[PDB]
Amino acid sequence: KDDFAKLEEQFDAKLGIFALDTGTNRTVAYRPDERFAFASTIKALTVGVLLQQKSIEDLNQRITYTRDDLVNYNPITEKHVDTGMTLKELADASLRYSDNAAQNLILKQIGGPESLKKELRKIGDEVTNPERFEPELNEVNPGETQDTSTARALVTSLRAFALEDPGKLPSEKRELLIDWMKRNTTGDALIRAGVPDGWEVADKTGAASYGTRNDIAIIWPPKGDPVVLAVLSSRDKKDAKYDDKLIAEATKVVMKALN
Amino acid sequence: VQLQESGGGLVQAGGSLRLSCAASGRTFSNDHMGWFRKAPGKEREFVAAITPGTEKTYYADSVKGRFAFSRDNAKNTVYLQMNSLKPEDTAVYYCVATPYYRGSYYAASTYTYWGQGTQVTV
Numbered sequence A: 001k002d003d004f005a006k007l008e009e010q011f012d013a014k015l016g017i018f019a020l021d022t023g024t025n026r027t028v029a030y031r032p033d034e035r036f037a038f039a040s041t042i043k044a045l046t047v048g049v050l051l052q053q054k055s056i057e058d059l060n061q062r063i064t065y066t067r068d069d070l071v072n073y074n075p076i077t078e079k080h081v082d083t084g085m086t087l088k089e090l091a092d093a094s095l096r097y098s099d100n101a102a103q104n105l106i107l108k109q110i111g112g113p114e115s116l117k118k119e120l121r122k123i124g125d126e127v128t129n130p131e132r133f134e135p136e137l138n139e140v141n142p143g144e145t146q147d148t149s150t151a152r153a154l155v156t157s158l159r160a161f162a163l164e165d166p167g168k169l170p171s172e173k174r175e176l177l178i179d180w181m182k183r184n185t186t187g188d189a190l191i192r193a194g195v196p197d198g199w200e201v202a203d204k205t206g207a208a209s210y211g212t213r214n215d216i217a218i219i220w221p222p223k224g225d226p227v228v229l230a231v232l233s234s235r236d237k238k239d240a241k242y243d244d245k246l247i248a249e250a251t252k253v254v255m256k257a258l259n
Numbered sequence B: 001v002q003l004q005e006s007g008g009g010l011v012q013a014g015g016s017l018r019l020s021c022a023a024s025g026r027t028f029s030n031d032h033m034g035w036f037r038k039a040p041g042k043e044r045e046f047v048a049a050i051t052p053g054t055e056k057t058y059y060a061d062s063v064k065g066r067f068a069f070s071r072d073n074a075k076n077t078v079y080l081q082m083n084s085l086k087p088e089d090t091a092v093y094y095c096v097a098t099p100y101y102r103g104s105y106y107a108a109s110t111y112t113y114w115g116q117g118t119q120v121t122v
Helices: A002-010 A039-053 A087-097 A100-109 A113-122 A151-162 A171-182 A244-258
Strands: A014-021 A027-030 A200-208 A212-220 A227-234 B002-006 B017-024 B032-038 B045-050 B057-059 B067-072 B077-082 B091-098 B118-120
Touching: A002 A014, A002 A244, A014 A151, A014 A244, A027 A244, A039 A087, A039 A100, A039 A113, A039 A151, A039 A171, A039 A200, A039 A212, A087 A100, A087 A171, A151 A171, A151 A212, A151 A227, A171 A200, A171 A212, A212 A244, A227 A244, B002 B091, B017 B032, B017 B091, B017 B118, B032 B067, B045 B067, B045 B077, B057 B067
Parallel strands: none
Antiparallel strands: A014 A027, A014 A227, A200 A212, A212 A227, B002 B017, B017 B077, B032 B045, B032 B091, B045 B057, B067 B077, B091 B118
16 A cells, blocks of 8 residues: 555656456455546447447448548558458557547447447446547546546456456457457556566556556466456646556556465 | 638748638537648648537647637637747648537548638748
8 A cells, every 4th residue: 555655656646556356356456436537548448349239240341431530640540541441450450559540430330439438337337437539538637527437447347348257248259359458569568567477468558638647457367367457647737747667566566465 | 601711821930820710601609610731742630629618629739839729609700829830830721610529629520611721831
């Protein structure tokens, strides 16, 4: 407990932490019910909802789009304007590269942010508040509830989609979500940097206004049951920068507490 | 119905321009307004966006701190005050509108009402 307070002070930041060992139900919590802008971590839950609504076959449906659909960060989507991309390809881009237009196209396919909210409430998430598209969802002022969640809610929702208990997705679809998250390219300095070598990691990162820096993950020991955790952080000033080391260090504290 | 943009043209680096977007045919007071720009050769990019109620403003990083989006519901006009103009700001400025939030403010496909555009030179 005092370890997390010490970390907060070292990085001039505020932490929100929740971790659950699914094998023992042992938990690690630090401000687990405090709201933070969820930022791109929402992309994992958006895909979870997409997977509840579409068959594996239906993920092969090609989605056409134009340059008018592109936003501020389109690493993959900008390359396929001419042909379009399948729902499978869009989910890959959104999760592995944090492609913003890919998230927006998926969000439109599932009915928009209000539909994502309804589907999250249906799985029992009464806290996550989807409201906006990318990148405007990153513009959260402290005190606002729009486009925010908590460490506890994000772990609960991530666990619901990714794991067999409480299996909100069938096995084949869970496998897809886990595979994409395991092959994420954006989180090497976050949760991945705080877990021991040999443990497998499936994560989704996010960064937003007020120096918000987040990472949510499912982590596996070489042998045994997974840990689901969320490490969220923010700062007092609008134009504050973040340090990935805060997340990596907070992950190290969590792992000590769990082992 | 039409959206006509004025206040653009010949200006020096570091100077200021106030772009005016005059509406006609219908009231645009309940509409989510915005600005987009297109430079010769360079791709069309988002500039600014404003909501109808609370009037929340959204600006591109490339324009943030220098530009200011403001409304005038009575005159059926929206304004874009551009300060500390850079050679980078040289483009054709388009006034955009949508009655509802159908997508991202940064996405051109989100706007159902488009203007003819006004030339801005630095």
